[PDB]
Amino acid sequence: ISADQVNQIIYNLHHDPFEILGCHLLEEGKNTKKWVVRAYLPKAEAAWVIRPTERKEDPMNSVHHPNFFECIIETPELNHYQLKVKEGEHEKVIYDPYAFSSPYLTDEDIYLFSEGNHHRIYEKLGAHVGEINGVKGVYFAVWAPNARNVSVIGDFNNWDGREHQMRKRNYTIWELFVPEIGSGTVYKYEIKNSEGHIYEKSDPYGFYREVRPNTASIVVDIDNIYQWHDEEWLEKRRNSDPLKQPVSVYEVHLGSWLHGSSAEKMPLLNGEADPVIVSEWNPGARFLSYYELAEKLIPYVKDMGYTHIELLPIAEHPFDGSWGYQVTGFYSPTSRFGRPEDFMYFVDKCHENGIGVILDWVPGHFPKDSHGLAYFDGTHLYEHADPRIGEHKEWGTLVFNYGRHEVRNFLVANVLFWFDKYHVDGIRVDAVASMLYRNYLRKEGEWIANEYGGDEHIEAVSFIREVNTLLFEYFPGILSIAEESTEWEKVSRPVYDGGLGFNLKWDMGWMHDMLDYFNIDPYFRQYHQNNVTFSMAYYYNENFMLALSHDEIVHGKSNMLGKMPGDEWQKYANVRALFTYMYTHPGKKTMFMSMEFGQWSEWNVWGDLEWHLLQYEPHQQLKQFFTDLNALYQQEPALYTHDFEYHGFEAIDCNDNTHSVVSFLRRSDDPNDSLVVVCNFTPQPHSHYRIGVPEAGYYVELFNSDAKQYGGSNMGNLGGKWADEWSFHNKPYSLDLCLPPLAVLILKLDPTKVP
Ligand SMILES: [Mg+2]
Ligand SMILES: [Mg+2]
């Protein structure tokens, strides 16, 4: 490029910047091509072109002006890249804003989509505000290869699509531009299938939707509705390893955390909307918006001291009672809580308060609801045609055909979508077994094996690896969490080592051992000491997430307190002991809303939590307990730097089953950060209990779950205890401790203390 051309860009005299900025072919070689990417980045000193899927990074050079950059790259195709931009001391990563000249699909789009590799297909499929033949309007497009005809119906044509019949392209995708209309437009696709049958569909790539039980899609100008402020958070995340950081997650179901009154409007971000009544049976209650949740949930979580909030599925879903696990609008945040910008605001605000956001994502199945994906074009399009692999008969749902390219693409681009447009920090996938096995919940003779006679669902496995491969390449630094319940191997290991590519796995075994154990009367826990006995062999095969989830306080299992034996004082003590144990055991942490204040009743998705309990001291104390423990967890490196290395944990003694006492060390980079943890899982206190430690010195009583401010009896070691030179448990020195009843202590050597 020339200076004259650069100047035309810098000073806004150029008639079409897309001619120059973005990616352009320079020439074709025998087996490769030569491209240039150009970018005008005012205030940037430096830039790079990232090719995350090829694992490459090329720097850009300033050209004729300090803020005009180019980068010449040789490669056969250059479909997938990002720009890294440095302003002062800060970097950001972004998609190239001059990536797409036109709103309509190109041959190249269509080709990539057919191969299942269009990582940004949602830029072209769905509905997008743009300009064609010099007029502003909306471009629509939808994949429906076997349809006889498709038309766009909506407010703008009184639901009569005779003058808005779409044009089929490449025997595969229907499109139409409609001038003059814009964002807010309400619409569906009217489809005629091969038999002549006519029926309406919501837009599978729709970005917003009417409020359930209505189903029309709504047009959104998704790149011009919200201004972000979270560059610093994103940079910090890209440049860190979250496995080495504290990760304490508050799991929340947005629809049942807190309700408001249906006698007023739902405030949104600079606006308001009609209330969304939680149910016909509770009509005085409405949902809170994403906006009101940002104002209320976020400072709450910040005070509690959690690092992340994990949301039950927020993709658009028709039935509250599914909890979100049955999705019909994969590309829109549910309209129960307001608008897409309101949820952007929610994420932006978590990030301003140093809180991350993890989404439950549901790629395993979808329901039969006739507005959604089912039998989409009068064939089994999204779902596989054979019900032995394409239905979960016991759940009443359909299973995506992962081997079909445009279906894989639907899903893979969807996961990337949430990271791109809504800046989320991770995902969690429920019931991963449901994808992995060809015989899942299927009786004998009612399923078929793979091409090698195995039970492994090959296509699905391959899809899962692509999802995790691409996520981490595009957004290093995120969390990809799996719950997999069949001891499948290498869930949270890299795809290159034969793993599924997640970086964390829920420890369901740990969960059952914990809840079976605390449920047993204290006397009888001596017969079940193996539950509280760390198992090196199993633990280090996965990066574990210790989750006490929503699934464990429904359907007659009781909430946490109800699970525990004893009188009221003991039930609380049990909760404090279990969770103090959980925060000290290796692994990341997840707990569900209502557990942190001792809700007595089971989570009920149709109401909100029992906030009135926080008027009373026991509930308050338990909440101060979680507040302090989260603070502790963030301040003590040995609780998070080495969850997944041998160094991080060492058992001290695990054999006093007769008293249900267990003890261990946690460690970090500095030996002075080591922590001694001692747990007493009965109501019997102990005035002299000797515990081996690694060094002489004074050990501070850093945490004590029996403290009176947590509702405990306040027994303890009054500040800490000098070690005796007295071998015990194969350790040179030892402590003679007071152990409080149903309680856990954490001690820490202060090596600068006056003997
Ligand atoms: Mg009609
Ligand atoms: Mg209530």
mmCIF file with all atom_site columns, C-alpha atoms in Angstrom, residues 455-621:
data_model
loop_
_atom_site.group_PDB
_atom_site.id
_atom_site.type_symbol
_atom_site.label_atom_id
_atom_site.label_alt_id
_atom_site.label_comp_id
_atom_site.label_asym_id
_atom_site.label_entity_id
_atom_site.label_seq_id
_atom_site.pdbx_PDB_ins_code
_atom_site.Cartn_x
_atom_site.Cartn_y
_atom_site.Cartn_z
_atom_site.occupancy
_atom_site.B_iso_or_equiv
_atom_site.pdbx_formal_charge
_atom_site.auth_seq_id
_atom_site.auth_comp_id
_atom_site.auth_asym_id
_atom_site.auth_atom_id
_atom_site.pdbx_PDB_model_num
ATOM 1   C CA . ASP A 1 455 ? -20.433 -48.290 22.554 1.00 0.00 ? 455 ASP A CA 1
ATOM 2   C CA . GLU A 1 456 ? -18.539 -44.904 22.003 1.00 0.00 ? 456 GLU A CA 1
ATOM 3   C CA . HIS A 1 457 ? -20.524 -42.197 20.178 1.00 0.00 ? 457 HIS A CA 1
ATOM 4   C CA . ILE A 1 458 ? -17.695 -41.253 17.856 1.00 0.00 ? 458 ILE A CA 1
ATOM 5   C CA . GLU A 1 459 ? -19.181 -38.197 16.203 1.00 0.00 ? 459 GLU A CA 1
ATOM 6   C CA . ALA A 1 460 ? -20.054 -36.711 19.571 1.00 0.00 ? 460 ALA A CA 1
ATOM 7   C CA . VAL A 1 461 ? -16.629 -37.313 20.975 1.00 0.00 ? 461 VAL A CA 1
ATOM 8   C CA . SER A 1 462 ? -15.172 -35.695 17.944 1.00 0.00 ? 462 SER A CA 1
ATOM 9   C CA . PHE A 1 463 ? -17.578 -32.735 18.311 1.00 0.00 ? 463 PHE A CA 1
ATOM 10  C CA . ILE A 1 464 ? -16.706 -32.296 21.971 1.00 0.00 ? 464 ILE A CA 1
ATOM 11  C CA . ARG A 1 465 ? -12.971 -32.187 21.090 1.00 0.00 ? 465 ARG A CA 1
ATOM 12  C CA . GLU A 1 466 ? -13.503 -29.614 18.394 1.00 0.00 ? 466 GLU A CA 1
ATOM 13  C CA . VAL A 1 467 ? -15.506 -27.430 20.853 1.00 0.00 ? 467 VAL A CA 1
ATOM 14  C CA . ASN A 1 468 ? -12.691 -27.440 23.418 1.00 0.00 ? 468 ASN A CA 1
ATOM 15  C CA . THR A 1 469 ? -9.921  -27.216 20.923 1.00 0.00 ? 469 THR A CA 1
ATOM 16  C CA . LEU A 1 470 ? -11.441 -24.056 19.419 1.00 0.00 ? 470 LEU A CA 1
ATOM 17  C CA . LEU A 1 471 ? -12.506 -22.412 22.689 1.00 0.00 ? 471 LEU A CA 1
ATOM 18  C CA . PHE A 1 472 ? -9.069  -22.476 24.172 1.00 0.00 ? 472 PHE A CA 1
ATOM 19  C CA . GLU A 1 473 ? -7.389  -21.326 20.992 1.00 0.00 ? 473 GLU A CA 1
ATOM 20  C CA . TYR A 1 474 ? -9.735  -18.368 20.553 1.00 0.00 ? 474 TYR A CA 1
ATOM 21  C CA . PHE A 1 475 ? -10.071 -17.543 24.308 1.00 0.00 ? 475 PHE A CA 1
ATOM 22  C CA . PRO A 1 476 ? -7.270  -19.007 26.276 1.00 0.00 ? 476 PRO A CA 1
ATOM 23  C CA . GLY A 1 477 ? -7.850  -18.454 29.900 1.00 0.00 ? 477 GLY A CA 1
ATOM 24  C CA . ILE A 1 478 ? -11.465 -19.677 30.073 1.00 0.00 ? 478 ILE A CA 1
ATOM 25  C CA . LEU A 1 479 ? -13.029 -22.465 32.090 1.00 0.00 ? 479 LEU A CA 1
ATOM 26  C CA . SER A 1 480 ? -14.567 -25.458 30.306 1.00 0.00 ? 480 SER A CA 1
ATOM 27  C CA . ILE A 1 481 ? -16.138 -27.663 32.987 1.00 0.00 ? 481 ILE A CA 1
ATOM 28  C CA . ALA A 1 482 ? -17.703 -31.121 32.493 1.00 0.00 ? 482 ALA A CA 1
ATOM 29  C CA . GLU A 1 483 ? -19.938 -33.282 34.597 1.00 0.00 ? 483 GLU A CA 1
ATOM 30  C CA . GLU A 1 484 ? -19.357 -36.805 33.411 1.00 0.00 ? 484 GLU A CA 1
ATOM 31  C CA . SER A 1 485 ? -20.725 -39.644 35.414 1.00 0.00 ? 485 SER A CA 1
ATOM 32  C CA . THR A 1 486 ? -19.256 -42.915 34.025 1.00 0.00 ? 486 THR A CA 1
ATOM 33  C CA . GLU A 1 487 ? -15.526 -42.724 34.798 1.00 0.00 ? 487 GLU A CA 1
ATOM 34  C CA . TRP A 1 488 ? -14.712 -41.889 31.158 1.00 0.00 ? 488 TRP A CA 1
ATOM 35  C CA . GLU A 1 489 ? -11.020 -41.221 30.894 1.00 0.00 ? 489 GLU A CA 1
ATOM 36  C CA . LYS A 1 490 ? -9.207  -37.994 30.462 1.00 0.00 ? 490 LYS A CA 1
ATOM 37  C CA . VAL A 1 491 ? -12.163 -35.670 30.541 1.00 0.00 ? 491 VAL A CA 1
ATOM 38  C CA . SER A 1 492 ? -10.159 -32.654 31.693 1.00 0.00 ? 492 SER A CA 1
ATOM 39  C CA . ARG A 1 493 ? -7.058  -33.421 29.722 1.00 0.00 ? 493 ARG A CA 1
ATOM 40  C CA . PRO A 1 494 ? -5.839  -32.006 26.391 1.00 0.00 ? 494 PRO A CA 1
ATOM 41  C CA . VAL A 1 495 ? -7.186  -33.337 23.177 1.00 0.00 ? 495 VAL A CA 1
ATOM 42  C CA . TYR A 1 496 ? -3.579  -34.035 21.943 1.00 0.00 ? 496 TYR A CA 1
ATOM 43  C CA . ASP A 1 497 ? -3.128  -36.561 24.845 1.00 0.00 ? 497 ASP A CA 1
ATOM 44  C CA . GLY A 1 498 ? -6.423  -38.290 23.942 1.00 0.00 ? 498 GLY A CA 1
ATOM 45  C CA . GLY A 1 499 ? -8.535  -36.155 26.330 1.00 0.00 ? 499 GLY A CA 1
ATOM 46  C CA . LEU A 1 500 ? -11.939 -34.447 25.736 1.00 0.00 ? 500 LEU A CA 1
ATOM 47  C CA . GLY A 1 501 ? -10.314 -31.066 26.242 1.00 0.00 ? 501 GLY A CA 1
ATOM 48  C CA . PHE A 1 502 ? -12.126 -29.750 29.317 1.00 0.00 ? 502 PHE A CA 1
ATOM 49  C CA . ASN A 1 503 ? -9.910  -28.165 32.042 1.00 0.00 ? 503 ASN A CA 1
ATOM 50  C CA . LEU A 1 504 ? -12.174 -29.124 34.886 1.00 0.00 ? 504 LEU A CA 1
ATOM 51  C CA . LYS A 1 505 ? -14.443 -32.063 35.758 1.00 0.00 ? 505 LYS A CA 1
ATOM 52  C CA . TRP A 1 506 ? -17.035 -32.152 38.545 1.00 0.00 ? 506 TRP A CA 1
ATOM 53  C CA . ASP A 1 507 ? -16.047 -34.619 41.243 1.00 0.00 ? 507 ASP A CA 1
ATOM 54  C CA . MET A 1 508 ? -19.300 -36.531 41.539 1.00 0.00 ? 508 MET A CA 1
ATOM 55  C CA . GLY A 1 509 ? -17.666 -39.365 43.526 1.00 0.00 ? 509 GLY A CA 1
ATOM 56  C CA . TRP A 1 510 ? -16.389 -36.740 46.055 1.00 0.00 ? 510 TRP A CA 1
ATOM 57  C CA . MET A 1 511 ? -19.890 -35.299 46.188 1.00 0.00 ? 511 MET A CA 1
ATOM 58  C CA . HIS A 1 512 ? -21.628 -38.578 46.945 1.00 0.00 ? 512 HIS A CA 1
ATOM 59  C CA . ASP A 1 513 ? -18.959 -39.519 49.525 1.00 0.00 ? 513 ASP A CA 1
ATOM 60  C CA . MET A 1 514 ? -19.427 -36.230 51.237 1.00 0.00 ? 514 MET A CA 1
ATOM 61  C CA . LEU A 1 515 ? -23.201 -36.238 51.400 1.00 0.00 ? 515 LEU A CA 1
ATOM 62  C CA . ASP A 1 516 ? -23.484 -40.014 52.230 1.00 0.00 ? 516 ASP A CA 1
ATOM 63  C CA . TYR A 1 517 ? -20.869 -39.393 54.975 1.00 0.00 ? 517 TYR A CA 1
ATOM 64  C CA . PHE A 1 518 ? -22.329 -36.288 56.664 1.00 0.00 ? 518 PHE A CA 1
ATOM 65  C CA . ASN A 1 519 ? -25.701 -37.826 56.538 1.00 0.00 ? 519 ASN A CA 1
ATOM 66  C CA . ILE A 1 520 ? -24.563 -40.687 58.852 1.00 0.00 ? 520 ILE A CA 1
ATOM 67  C CA . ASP A 1 521 ? -25.015 -40.212 62.662 1.00 0.00 ? 521 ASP A CA 1
ATOM 68  C CA . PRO A 1 522 ? -21.610 -39.222 64.033 1.00 0.00 ? 522 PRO A CA 1
ATOM 69  C CA . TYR A 1 523 ? -21.069 -42.464 66.034 1.00 0.00 ? 523 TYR A CA 1
ATOM 70  C CA . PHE A 1 524 ? -21.367 -44.482 62.814 1.00 0.00 ? 524 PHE A CA 1
ATOM 71  C CA . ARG A 1 525 ? -18.959 -42.408 60.714 1.00 0.00 ? 525 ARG A CA 1
ATOM 72  C CA . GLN A 1 526 ? -16.121 -44.655 62.076 1.00 0.00 ? 526 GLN A CA 1
ATOM 73  C CA . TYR A 1 527 ? -17.458 -47.363 59.674 1.00 0.00 ? 527 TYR A CA 1
ATOM 74  C CA . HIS A 1 528 ? -17.157 -44.935 56.774 1.00 0.00 ? 528 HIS A CA 1
ATOM 75  C CA . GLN A 1 529 ? -13.804 -43.210 57.300 1.00 0.00 ? 529 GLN A CA 1
ATOM 76  C CA . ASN A 1 530 ? -12.982 -44.194 53.678 1.00 0.00 ? 530 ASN A CA 1
ATOM 77  C CA . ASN A 1 531 ? -15.391 -41.401 52.496 1.00 0.00 ? 531 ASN A CA 1
ATOM 78  C CA . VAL A 1 532 ? -13.102 -38.747 54.080 1.00 0.00 ? 532 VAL A CA 1
ATOM 79  C CA . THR A 1 533 ? -9.931  -40.369 52.835 1.00 0.00 ? 533 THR A CA 1
ATOM 80  C CA . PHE A 1 534 ? -8.195  -38.685 50.028 1.00 0.00 ? 534 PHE A CA 1
ATOM 81  C CA . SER A 1 535 ? -7.128  -41.020 47.317 1.00 0.00 ? 535 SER A CA 1
ATOM 82  C CA . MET A 1 536 ? -4.027  -39.894 45.400 1.00 0.00 ? 536 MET A CA 1
ATOM 83  C CA . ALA A 1 537 ? -4.499  -42.605 42.640 1.00 0.00 ? 537 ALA A CA 1
ATOM 84  C CA . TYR A 1 538 ? -8.006  -41.260 41.577 1.00 0.00 ? 538 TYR A CA 1
ATOM 85  C CA . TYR A 1 539 ? -7.606  -37.571 42.346 1.00 0.00 ? 539 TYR A CA 1
ATOM 86  C CA . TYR A 1 540 ? -4.649  -36.740 40.135 1.00 0.00 ? 540 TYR A CA 1
ATOM 87  C CA . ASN A 1 541 ? -6.214  -38.156 36.921 1.00 0.00 ? 541 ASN A CA 1
ATOM 88  C CA . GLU A 1 542 ? -8.434  -35.121 36.423 1.00 0.00 ? 542 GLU A CA 1
ATOM 89  C CA . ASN A 1 543 ? -8.538  -31.492 37.432 1.00 0.00 ? 543 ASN A CA 1
ATOM 90  C CA . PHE A 1 544 ? -11.418 -31.676 39.822 1.00 0.00 ? 544 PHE A CA 1
ATOM 91  C CA . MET A 1 545 ? -14.112 -29.232 40.616 1.00 0.00 ? 545 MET A CA 1
ATOM 92  C CA . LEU A 1 546 ? -15.758 -29.914 43.968 1.00 0.00 ? 546 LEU A CA 1
ATOM 93  C CA . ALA A 1 547 ? -19.405 -29.192 43.324 1.00 0.00 ? 547 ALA A CA 1
ATOM 94  C CA . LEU A 1 548 ? -22.315 -29.188 45.689 1.00 0.00 ? 548 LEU A CA 1
ATOM 95  C CA . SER A 1 549 ? -24.919 -28.304 43.127 1.00 0.00 ? 549 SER A CA 1
ATOM 96  C CA . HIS A 1 550 ? -28.578 -27.532 42.632 1.00 0.00 ? 550 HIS A CA 1
ATOM 97  C CA . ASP A 1 551 ? -29.224 -31.142 41.728 1.00 0.00 ? 551 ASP A CA 1
ATOM 98  C CA . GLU A 1 552 ? -28.455 -32.149 45.357 1.00 0.00 ? 552 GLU A CA 1
ATOM 99  C CA . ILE A 1 553 ? -31.149 -30.033 47.091 1.00 0.00 ? 553 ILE A CA 1
ATOM 100 C CA . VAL A 1 554 ? -34.279 -30.969 45.133 1.00 0.00 ? 554 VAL A CA 1
ATOM 101 C CA . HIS A 1 555 ? -36.671 -34.013 44.794 1.00 0.00 ? 555 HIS A CA 1
ATOM 102 C CA . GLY A 1 556 ? -36.738 -35.094 48.384 1.00 0.00 ? 556 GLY A CA 1
ATOM 103 C CA . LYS A 1 557 ? -32.969 -34.846 49.087 1.00 0.00 ? 557 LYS A CA 1
ATOM 104 C CA . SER A 1 558 ? -33.360 -31.872 51.472 1.00 0.00 ? 558 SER A CA 1
ATOM 105 C CA . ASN A 1 559 ? -31.346 -28.744 51.589 1.00 0.00 ? 559 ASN A CA 1
ATOM 106 C CA . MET A 1 560 ? -27.947 -28.974 53.304 1.00 0.00 ? 560 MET A CA 1
ATOM 107 C CA . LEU A 1 561 ? -29.066 -28.539 56.913 1.00 0.00 ? 561 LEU A CA 1
ATOM 108 C CA . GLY A 1 562 ? -31.818 -31.071 56.501 1.00 0.00 ? 562 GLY A CA 1
ATOM 109 C CA . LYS A 1 563 ? -29.316 -33.645 55.415 1.00 0.00 ? 563 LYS A CA 1
ATOM 110 C CA . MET A 1 564 ? -27.522 -33.474 58.720 1.00 0.00 ? 564 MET A CA 1
ATOM 111 C CA . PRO A 1 565 ? -28.121 -35.501 61.926 1.00 0.00 ? 565 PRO A CA 1
ATOM 112 C CA . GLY A 1 566 ? -28.486 -34.018 65.398 1.00 0.00 ? 566 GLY A CA 1
ATOM 113 C CA . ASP A 1 567 ? -30.166 -31.056 66.994 1.00 0.00 ? 567 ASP A CA 1
ATOM 114 C CA . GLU A 1 568 ? -30.168 -27.679 65.431 1.00 0.00 ? 568 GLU A CA 1
ATOM 115 C CA . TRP A 1 569 ? -26.776 -26.680 66.850 1.00 0.00 ? 569 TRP A CA 1
ATOM 116 C CA . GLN A 1 570 ? -25.251 -29.859 65.321 1.00 0.00 ? 570 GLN A CA 1
ATOM 117 C CA . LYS A 1 571 ? -26.827 -29.572 61.979 1.00 0.00 ? 571 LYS A CA 1
ATOM 118 C CA . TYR A 1 572 ? -25.213 -26.140 61.479 1.00 0.00 ? 572 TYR A CA 1
ATOM 119 C CA . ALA A 1 573 ? -21.875 -27.384 62.832 1.00 0.00 ? 573 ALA A CA 1
ATOM 120 C CA . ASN A 1 574 ? -22.014 -30.211 60.351 1.00 0.00 ? 574 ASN A CA 1
ATOM 121 C CA . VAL A 1 575 ? -22.560 -27.753 57.468 1.00 0.00 ? 575 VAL A CA 1
ATOM 122 C CA . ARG A 1 576 ? -19.629 -25.590 58.613 1.00 0.00 ? 576 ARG A CA 1
ATOM 123 C CA . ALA A 1 577 ? -17.384 -28.623 58.950 1.00 0.00 ? 577 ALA A CA 1
ATOM 124 C CA . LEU A 1 578 ? -18.300 -30.034 55.573 1.00 0.00 ? 578 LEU A CA 1
ATOM 125 C CA . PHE A 1 579 ? -17.744 -26.795 53.750 1.00 0.00 ? 579 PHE A CA 1
ATOM 126 C CA . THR A 1 580 ? -14.559 -25.912 55.623 1.00 0.00 ? 580 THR A CA 1
ATOM 127 C CA . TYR A 1 581 ? -13.365 -29.403 54.615 1.00 0.00 ? 581 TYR A CA 1
ATOM 128 C CA . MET A 1 582 ? -14.462 -28.728 51.035 1.00 0.00 ? 582 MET A CA 1
ATOM 129 C CA . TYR A 1 583 ? -12.578 -25.416 50.873 1.00 0.00 ? 583 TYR A CA 1
ATOM 130 C CA . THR A 1 584 ? -9.422  -27.179 52.146 1.00 0.00 ? 584 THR A CA 1
ATOM 131 C CA . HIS A 1 585 ? -9.581  -30.291 50.045 1.00 0.00 ? 585 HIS A CA 1
ATOM 132 C CA . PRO A 1 586 ? -7.758  -29.993 46.745 1.00 0.00 ? 586 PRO A CA 1
ATOM 133 C CA . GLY A 1 587 ? -9.873  -28.752 43.916 1.00 0.00 ? 587 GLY A CA 1
ATOM 134 C CA . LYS A 1 588 ? -11.912 -25.772 42.800 1.00 0.00 ? 588 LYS A CA 1
ATOM 135 C CA . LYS A 1 589 ? -15.201 -25.033 44.528 1.00 0.00 ? 589 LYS A CA 1
ATOM 136 C CA . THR A 1 590 ? -18.817 -24.699 43.462 1.00 0.00 ? 590 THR A CA 1
ATOM 137 C CA . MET A 1 591 ? -21.903 -24.263 45.648 1.00 0.00 ? 591 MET A CA 1
ATOM 138 C CA . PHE A 1 592 ? -25.529 -23.399 44.900 1.00 0.00 ? 592 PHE A CA 1
ATOM 139 C CA . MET A 1 593 ? -27.616 -20.492 46.049 1.00 0.00 ? 593 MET A CA 1
ATOM 140 C CA . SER A 1 594 ? -29.379 -20.910 49.400 1.00 0.00 ? 594 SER A CA 1
ATOM 141 C CA . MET A 1 595 ? -26.621 -23.141 50.792 1.00 0.00 ? 595 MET A CA 1
ATOM 142 C CA . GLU A 1 596 ? -24.718 -20.124 52.022 1.00 0.00 ? 596 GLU A CA 1
ATOM 143 C CA . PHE A 1 597 ? -27.402 -18.983 54.541 1.00 0.00 ? 597 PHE A CA 1
ATOM 144 C CA . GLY A 1 598 ? -28.895 -22.327 55.584 1.00 0.00 ? 598 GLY A CA 1
ATOM 145 C CA . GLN A 1 599 ? -32.175 -22.412 53.743 1.00 0.00 ? 599 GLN A CA 1
ATOM 146 C CA . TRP A 1 600 ? -34.240 -25.184 55.313 1.00 0.00 ? 600 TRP A CA 1
ATOM 147 C CA . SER A 1 601 ? -36.405 -26.014 52.306 1.00 0.00 ? 601 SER A CA 1
ATOM 148 C CA . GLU A 1 602 ? -35.412 -27.553 49.027 1.00 0.00 ? 602 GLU A CA 1
ATOM 149 C CA . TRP A 1 603 ? -34.758 -25.265 46.109 1.00 0.00 ? 603 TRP A CA 1
ATOM 150 C CA . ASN A 1 604 ? -38.021 -24.511 44.426 1.00 0.00 ? 604 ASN A CA 1
ATOM 151 C CA . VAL A 1 605 ? -37.699 -23.304 40.890 1.00 0.00 ? 605 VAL A CA 1
ATOM 152 C CA . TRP A 1 606 ? -41.209 -21.843 40.949 1.00 0.00 ? 606 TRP A CA 1
ATOM 153 C CA . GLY A 1 607 ? -40.599 -19.412 43.851 1.00 0.00 ? 607 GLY A CA 1
ATOM 154 C CA . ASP A 1 608 ? -37.601 -17.487 45.093 1.00 0.00 ? 608 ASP A CA 1
ATOM 155 C CA . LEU A 1 609 ? -35.239 -18.205 47.959 1.00 0.00 ? 609 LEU A CA 1
ATOM 156 C CA . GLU A 1 610 ? -36.325 -17.848 51.565 1.00 0.00 ? 610 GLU A CA 1
ATOM 157 C CA . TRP A 1 611 ? -34.587 -14.497 52.142 1.00 0.00 ? 611 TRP A CA 1
ATOM 158 C CA . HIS A 1 612 ? -36.607 -13.838 55.294 1.00 0.00 ? 612 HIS A CA 1
ATOM 159 C CA . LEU A 1 613 ? -34.367 -16.376 57.085 1.00 0.00 ? 613 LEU A CA 1
ATOM 160 C CA . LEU A 1 614 ? -31.596 -13.763 57.108 1.00 0.00 ? 614 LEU A CA 1
ATOM 161 C CA . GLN A 1 615 ? -33.527 -11.855 59.746 1.00 0.00 ? 615 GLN A CA 1
ATOM 162 C CA . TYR A 1 616 ? -32.347 -14.468 62.248 1.00 0.00 ? 616 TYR A CA 1
ATOM 163 C CA . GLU A 1 617 ? -28.984 -14.968 63.898 1.00 0.00 ? 617 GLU A CA 1
ATOM 164 C CA . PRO A 1 618 ? -28.174 -18.629 62.962 1.00 0.00 ? 618 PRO A CA 1
ATOM 165 C CA . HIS A 1 619 ? -28.671 -17.864 59.242 1.00 0.00 ? 619 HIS A CA 1
ATOM 166 C CA . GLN A 1 620 ? -26.696 -14.669 59.566 1.00 0.00 ? 620 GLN A CA 1
ATOM 167 C CA . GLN A 1 621 ? -23.845 -16.456 61.282 1.00 0.00 ? 621 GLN A CA 1
#
